[PDB]
Write a protein that binds this ligand. Structure first.
Ligand code: T47
Ligand code: T47
Lengths: 304, 304
């Protein structure tokens, strides 16, 4: 029993982190096979960051300008290319600690672990969600760029995020490992405002199911609702609309608890309308939306 | 910017986790040098757990009865002993992945990372505190026992916790790596009730400092207080008494923010007396007490 905000074990990713230095800029790279992936803004002076032309800036860079260090050993760079907003540095040595891996582009509401790194060195691991506005609420200081987000399925790391920037509002933007930003963000020091940070309804429901499983039941009520009725309340409270797809995804938690999804919707409806009245659920005073149905099942069933 | 509940990278500990099987009971062991450490209740049938005599039960166990598996390779057990509530199994092979390590017995209020494991296999990593009642609020299913809590100082893992049991209230009890329980708990299936779960005042203050540093300032007020006046309010709200030692420990955060510790105490006082009025601090609707002053400094300064 007990339910915690839980990250994947980070060892497989720790083995992939390197330092990338171009001139005076240092950040993190991800070493997989004989390629180091890093944000392309490694080639910029903060002077460059106001309106960088990356193709023009990259013309001035040779393989020997990219200093790649894995622990205290230098890697030999034998090629470099720009894909979207990442650099791919070809090195002469395959990473011997390369795990089975995939690159995946996640959807808003999907959770992942971040291994925060500075100078290629892991500092910590936490769990995030891709927000519906394609920001993430991270913990990232200067030097953290190139830190990655990932999921693990048994022995296969799916890399979904690389950190590129903080918005003036202190939220985070980054790319998949093909270098494509999540959302409308660009790697420039310009006015970039996030949209509405809506609550991931299907995740809140999953976490309400987790609460029931772990003994927190005070919020269960005598009511039910319909997808359309629930969605009217969701819209009013800046909750994402709930679809039959979300209902289907909640089926196994429905089944395990014997609480119909639409009954738990009616519980959530009363919580939105009435607040917590100073009570807590799984040690939270607000409705947690950074657990997926898959996450709740995993943690509640103990998958490794 | 951003402030997250952050665990240590788990790789160094992942390399130490093994499966220990005695008869039909499987749990986790910690392999350091040529010793595997595990809960002594590995030798029990759940029948035994009602009033086990561990010395008598252990007489019936030989080295060959302890099945130790690291990945899919069996370790040869060449000795076994009971220290307090842990077994130390001597194996014929030093763990090649043994990190620099220490065993430390932590104080209530101290935070650590847990690597939750099942069958010697890591499932996840989260951050905990030793509660003032010497429980921890974990996420532990059957098979998770022998999972460890740790801190990392650069390259040295300090092991502070091994998981032994859930109380009927769904909170967790365990030992240091010398096998001594935190608090008054015993490894028996008996009536064991936790004391008052008081709030770790010095940690809440640290986290208020973290909030200011990361831009959440609405709760800063025009007031100050004294240790004695604050402590009257702390007692009323089941907060731990604040000492000059706690004030001294908060000095660097005081200095960085230019907010006197006693001013932040007066902020905390008004939050206790007035509640959050539906507002949040670092994405929480309650006062977080599982960040130490050291944790706040670390995450805010980016130590690896
Ligand atoms: C994450 C990190 O290490 N850094 C923050 C970004 N900074 C350069 C930069 C400025 C503006 C926009 C972008 Cl995409 C990058 C480097 C340090
Ligand atoms: C943690 C774990 O894997 N398990 C929970 C404890 N259980 C045996 C037990 C019962 C009662 C008290 C104690 Cl200390 C242990 C084994 C499974």
């Amino acid at each position: 029993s007990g339910f915690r905000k839980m990250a994947f074990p980070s060892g497989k990713v720790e083995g992939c982190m390197v330092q990338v230095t171009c001139g005076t800029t240092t950040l993190n790279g991800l070493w997989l096979d004989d390629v180091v992936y890093c944000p392309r803004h490694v080639i910029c002076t903060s002077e460059d960051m106001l309106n960088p032309n990356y193709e023009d800036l990259l013309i001035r860079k040779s393989n020997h300008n990219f200093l790649v260090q894995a622990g205290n050993v230098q890697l030999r760079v034998i090629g470099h290319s720009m894909q979207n907003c990442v650099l791919k540095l070809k090195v002469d040595t395959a990473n011997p600690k390369t795990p089975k891996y995939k690159f995946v582009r996640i959807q808003p509401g999907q959770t992942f672990s971040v291994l925060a790194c500075y100078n290629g060195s892991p500092s910590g691991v936490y769990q995030c969600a891709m927000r519906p506005n394609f920001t993430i609420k991270g913990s990232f200081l200067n030097g953290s760029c190139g830190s990655v987000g990932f999921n693990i399925d048994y022995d296969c790391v799916s890399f979904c995020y690389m950190h590129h920037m903080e918005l003036p509002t202190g939220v985070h933007a980054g790319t998949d490992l093909e270098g494509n930003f999540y959302g409308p963000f660009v790697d420039r020091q310009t006015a970039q405002a996030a949209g509405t940070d809506t609550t991931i309804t299907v995740n809140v429901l999953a976490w309400l199911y987790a609460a029931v499983i772990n003994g927190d039941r005070w919020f269960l009520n005598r009511f039910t609702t319909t997808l359309n009725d629930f969605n009217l309340v969701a819209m009013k409270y800046n909750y994402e609309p709930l679809t039959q797809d979300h209902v289907d995804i909640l089926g196994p938690l429905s089944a395990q608890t014997g609480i119909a999804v639409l009954d738990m919707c009616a519980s959530l409806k009363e919580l939105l309308q009435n607040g917590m009245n100073g009570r807590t659920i799984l040690g939270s005073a607000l409705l947690e939306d950074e657990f997926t149905p898959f996450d709740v099942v995993r943690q509640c069933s103990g998958v490794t």
